[PDB]
């Protein structure tokens, strides 16, 4: 079936341009579809930006007043978005989405790429282990965590034991303060399993090419 995937720089300076790529697999971009760009702002607000269809014909929202270009490269089976003169109001999650030209069916969206429009500097996170206090380890379950502090821009990825620990996890939305984000995640396991079965938080921050793999050590002797 058709699969779409956005790629492109996640941080853009005000007054410059955002440039995104959508890679289509499982279907030729010269057949049947309208290839759309859609973005999402805070508040469940979705805005249709435009399309390029299977014949190369385009359409875009008048809200974007001359700032938008939608193009394609049929040899690469990709289509593209350029949005110029960006401001902080263009910060949003950008999606590519194919719908069939004939009936609007078969809607297929990429995973979405966050683009932040900001002058603030890229900053790698510090990743701190959250080890439980002694008094809260004598129950049948135990909760551990990880604090990812001081990074910019979004996003980071966080897994536990390289993804093999996925049950009992809560990863919280980041909070932004002074142009840096902080995010936390908790994981809960059966207490008798820890510390015999180690637990590590794996954090990646693609914008700074940084990864941290932080093993949670108990408080007390290790």
């Amino acid at each position: 079936r058709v699969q779409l995937q956005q790629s492109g720089p996640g941080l853009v300076k005000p007054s410059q341009s955002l440039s995104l790529t959508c890679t289509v697999t499982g279907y030729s971009i010269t057949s049947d579809f309208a290839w759309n760009w859609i973005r999402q702002f805070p508040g469940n607000k979705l805005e249709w930006m435009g399309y390029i269809n299977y014949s190369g014909f385009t359409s875009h929202n008048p809200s974007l007043k001359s700032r938008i270009s939608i193009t394609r490269d049929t040899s690469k089976n990709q289509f593209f978005l350029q949005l110029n003169s960006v401001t902080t109001e263009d910060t949003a999650t950008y999606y590519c989405a194919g719908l069939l030209w004939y009936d609007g069916g078969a809607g297929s969206w990429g995973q979405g790429t966050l683009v932040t429009v900001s002058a603030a500097k890229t900053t790698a996170p510090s990743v701190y282990p959250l080890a439980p206090v002694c008094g809260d380890t004598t129950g049948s379950s135990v909760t551990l965590g990880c604090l990812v502090k001081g990074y910019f821009p979004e996003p980071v990825t966080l897994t536990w034991n390289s993804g093999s620990l996925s049950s009992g996890v809560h990863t919280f939305p980041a909070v932004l303060q002074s142009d840096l984000y902080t995010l936390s995640s908790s994981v809960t396991v059966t207490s008798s399993t820890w510390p015999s079965q180690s637990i590590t938080c794996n954090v990646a921050h693609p914008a700074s090419s940084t990864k941290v793999d932080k093993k949670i050590e108990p408080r007390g002797p290790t």
């Binding site: 069916g105 701190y128 909070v175």
Partner: protein, 219 residues
């Protein structure tokens, strides 16, 4: 431009019961060839929007048949015959008949479940962070229902208001609960000056707060 108005804004439904949501457009969405370009989509937490209904009344590709779209002209309805927890999220309508194409503002479907008290856990600053100059105290309030909850921080027994940042999860389809993290950030020097740190969670499941504490420099 066409305005797409969804109601209600939010709906809370018990698993197994039906759900019905409305989308009304400011202009008719029938076209010159007898097609009505009206779609419904669901956006689950942390995911992209996904197809449900198209052409006003047709099940889109792969979509469970528990979803039905009805209506015509300007008034459209989405019905879910029997709600499942994985149905939670935000439902949108979209129109493709009138340029520029527009979306409804969304309706959020919440799963109603039995009240649950939070599981509360507090964590001192790490040794690594303490070498930095800063000190963050973290409290998790996990797997509770309903979503409204209150957290209060105390340092040596007195309530502390600045330096507190909170974050809430979306509803979890696995158990229909909510979770919250609260982080109290101090300077290292202020943290090392005081002794006991307390997180108190107040939730409708109990008349008395759940209190979790530690002493700095005790395991």
């Amino acid at each position: 431009d066409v305005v797409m108005t969804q109601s209600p804004k939010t709906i809370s439904v018990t698993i197994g019961q039906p759900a019905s949501i409305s989308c009304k457009s400011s202009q008719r969405l029938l076209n010159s060839n007898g097609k009505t370009f009206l779609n419904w989509l669901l956006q689950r937490p942390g995911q992209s929007p996904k197809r449900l209904i198209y052409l006003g009344t047709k099940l889109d590709s792969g979509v469970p048949d528990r979803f039905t779209g009805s209506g015509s002209g300007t008034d459209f309805t989405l019905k879910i015959s029997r709600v499942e927890a994985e149905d939670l999220g935000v439902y949108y309508c979209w129109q493709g008949t009138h340029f520029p194409y527009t979306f409804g503002g969304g309706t959020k479907l919440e799963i109603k479940r039995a009240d649950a008290a939070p599981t509360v856990s507090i964590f001192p600053p790490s040794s690594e962070q303490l070498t930095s100059g800063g000190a963050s105290v973290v409290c998790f309030l996990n797997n509770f229902y309903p979503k409204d909850i209150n957290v209060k921080w105390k340092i040596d027994g007195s309530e502390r208001q600045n330096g507190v940042l909170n974050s809430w999860t979306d509803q979890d389809s696995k158990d229909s609960t909510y979770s919250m993290s609260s982080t109290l950030t101090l300077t290292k020097d202020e943290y090392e000056r005081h002794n006991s740190y307390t997180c108190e969670a107040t939730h409708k499941t109990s008349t008395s707060p759940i209190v979790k504490s530690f002493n700095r420099n005790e395991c």
